[PDB]
Ligand binder design. Structure first.
Ligand SMILES: [Cl-]
Ligand SMILES: [Cu+2]
Ligand SMILES: [Cu+2]
Ligand SMILES: [Cu+2]
Ligand SMILES: [Cu+2]
Ligand SMILES: [Cu+2]
Ligand SMILES: [Cu+2]
Ligand SMILES: [Cu+2]
Ligand SMILES: [Cu+2]
Ligand SMILES: [Cu+2]
Ligand SMILES: [Cu+2]
Ligand SMILES: [Cu+2]
Ligand SMILES: [Cu+2]
Ligand SMILES: [O-]
Ligand SMILES: [O-]
Ligand SMILES: [O-]
Ligand SMILES: [O]
Ligand SMILES: [O]
Ligand SMILES: [O]
Lengths: 316, 316, 317
């Protein structure tokens, strides 16, 4: 089918960590950008309006651009950039299946590295794996890093001379991340994204992960892991059988990554929280103000389209 | 069978490199911590006493904690910390096979990152692979990194603002490591662990490695490699057929890691030494005071339980 | 067959990026070093003369040195170093197939990390994969990093204390790299090497890569990827079917790696340029002064032997 979406680029401020508000260029004013969910073979049309002060593009990572290379989104190579105030339309056929993503391709070290210019693009195979058939919950985790020294000033950041001192999943640092709430018997698909410039060793306590897809394509030889290394650009899809009730932390195992501005704990940390496990008095997330769509799992149930999430919106 | 043992946590000092003594929090006062070797299905009981001035826990990485999540060792999630001077008992069933490990889960960026709070946990499968049946020598290699500036300073370190300037295997930097001594026809299992916060590209001269396990689970499709990338939290098991006598260095190929405080050589370097190869007067290790258990290879031969090793003990 | 080569080690200066000239120890005065291309089972003889002021060796990474360990090239382990002005001869049988490489094994954090002491060693299998037979273009991409503070000073660099602020493929930083020119129907083998001390996430726009070999040995279970992580010492071989005409950038996806001295763009970036696509006036590489051998693809067609390339040569003092 033909699916047409309108996107903006906005200058907004987001709260990444306690102690760290960050100036970003949010797609539709949010970080992660809106979930785009379509079916294998669809014709996609995205009209982009640049409501910021600087030029951008959108590149569709993993999208072949079969017969549409002029929509690849690379300045100086497939198009001239989208300037401030201007608009531009992308058209492509979603013939590549799986977990894809989209991001700015202007000044990528800064725009993608620390200005949040990215979001998920999920293409459903017309014919999914048997394994995907059993899935009861779909989960998106986009990891990135932040440089506090340049949080308020567009135009700097993302070089080897900068210090990345805050780490996140879906643009929040623990304890501002949210738990992954499951019930016994759930079949959980988790899609990891190396959205920023760091490497993330994602480790699930209490469970092994079945690695089923690399960069959205199904592996002929899936393998189990308790720790999955995710590096810039990559995606890994895993399956977790939620058959082991408890509270099980789920986090980046890169030691410096579980800090925030030098202080521990912080970073890409969540907790697999099983329904019905009694909450202890000392539980860090006792009485959490809970967001069931922090990993886009509600949005992912709503069919094809473009989904904003107010939990990800920034302030003007 | 039920395996019960007693572990303490001690403030001790170890020598990591010539010129670098390091204050660590050693399990049973040693780094690497004691080897725990059990069989698949064993019931494990660990009585832990914190004889240090700071709180810790012990998390059993790879252990599912099926119906025992309260033994997962995560402060604020599965337990309150073990305070200075107190004791805590962990109980779990070793139903997950393979190369596992354990480490503190309090202040992990420092404690695991630079204070040595880790050790190996090997669970023997009921049904080993055929190649595992042929193994004549079993080898543990736990890689980590060190920040010389905080060598004397508990409560500091393991942040992006620190500099990791020393590198090791089993808490020694070359030349203070030990050779891997083999004889022609040996079948060598090597287990690599990403114990600290760094990434290590483990490369065997003179030989290809067959990669057989990821995080302790057997791959359906094992593959050969001469260089295996090991990142924090991960384990890789390989097999080397010792069929090429010579002296063949075996080391981290990450260029900066074969240094020690800016000097070369150092870091995670050993040498596969074959019996009967004549020794040149210029061979760097011709007069080595040899420790046959530097890779726990002897301990691994002595039954099921917990094993200390005097060569890893620190000074009070 | 017996194949004998004479190699030198020279002090030269290479241009890594606009405004970054770098002092290196180039094999045959070039970085990447010369392509060595032999057949499985050949007996290789390499006579090395050190024309620089410092000691070196050559280690043959991936070469088993079966019964020839004393040619492994490691100082203090298998030999004494090759001192300034001296020579040394390596002999080994190429019985290990695939994408191998060679590099100095003295002071490696500096010599391999920033002095360009490395080059590719390709061993053709007697029995290549079926897919390898469809290949119409073979491509070598050797990634490394550079520390500008020590560009002019042999004897320093390659430590945790240093800052790697420039990045390259085959020792050039975009825009001084060259495009990968194909035509529709091409079958492209690319061989990625982690020559330096950095990690590189190589991403092909417009195409998936079929990953077929790890460290030169064929995988029983090849897999597709659009992003392949390459870390020091490793090689990956992939296949790209060139069936999607466009201009498709191909680059290290590690964000800080697409910079040069703190500026963007730069780093390990090329463009897959399909012959049939009309060139726009704003295209960054319109009228590029083109080197068709930037990825050794012409040398790789020219038979067994050792091949220099002037596009990689630096300047003598
Ligand atoms: Cl064409
Ligand atoms: Cu942008
Ligand atoms: Cu991308
Ligand atoms: Cu892309
Ligand atoms: Cu953990
Ligand atoms: Cu601790
Ligand atoms: Cu762990
Ligand atoms: Cu764990
Ligand atoms: Cu080596
Ligand atoms: Cu050298
Ligand atoms: Cu090497
Ligand atoms: Cu080697
Ligand atoms: Cu790109
Ligand atoms: O952990
Ligand atoms: O090496
Ligand atoms: O990208
Ligand atoms: O990309
Ligand atoms: O863990
Ligand atoms: O090597």
């Amino acid at each position: 089918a033909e699916r047409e979406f309108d996107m903006t680029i906005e200058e907004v401020t987001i709260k990444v960590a306690p102690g760290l508000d960050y100036k970003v260029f949010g797609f539709n004013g949010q970080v992660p950008g809106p979930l785009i969910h379509v079916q294998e073979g669809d014709d996609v049309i995205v009209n982009v309006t640049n409501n910021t002060s600087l030029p951008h593009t959108i590149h569709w990572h993993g999208v072949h651009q079969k017969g549409t290379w002029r929509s690849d989104g690379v300045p100086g190579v497939t198009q001239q950039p989208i300037e401030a105030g201007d608009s531009y339309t992308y058209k492509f056929k979603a013939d590549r299946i799986g977990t894809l993503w989209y991001h700015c391709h202007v000044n990528v070290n800064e725009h993608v590295g620390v200005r949040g210019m990215w979001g998920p693009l999920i293409v459903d195979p017309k014919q999914p794996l048997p394994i995907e058939k059993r899935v009861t919950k779909d989960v998106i985790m986009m990891m990135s890093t932040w440089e506090s020294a340049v949080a308020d000033k567009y135009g700097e950041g993302g070089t080897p001379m900068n210090v990345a001192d805050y780490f996140s999943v879906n643009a929040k640092s623990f304890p501002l991340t949210q738990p992954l709430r499951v019930k016994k018997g759930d079949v959980v698909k988790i899609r990891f994204f190396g959205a920023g410039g760091g490497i993330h060793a994602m480790h699930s306590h209490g469970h092994d992960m079945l690695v089923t897809h690399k960069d959205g394509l199904p592996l002929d030889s899936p393998y189990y892991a308790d720790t999955v290394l995710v590096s810039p650009g990559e995606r890994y899809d895993v399956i977790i059988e939620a058959d082991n009730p408890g509270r099980f932390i789920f986090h980046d195992h890169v030691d410096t990554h579980v800090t925030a501005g030098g202080k521990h704990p912080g970073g890409p940390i969540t907790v697999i929280e099983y329904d019905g496990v009694p909450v202890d008095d000392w539980y860090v997330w006792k009485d959490k103000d809970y967001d069931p769509n922090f990993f886009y799992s509600e949005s992912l149930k709503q069919g094809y389209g473009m989904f904003d999430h107010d939990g990800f919106k920034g302030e003007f």
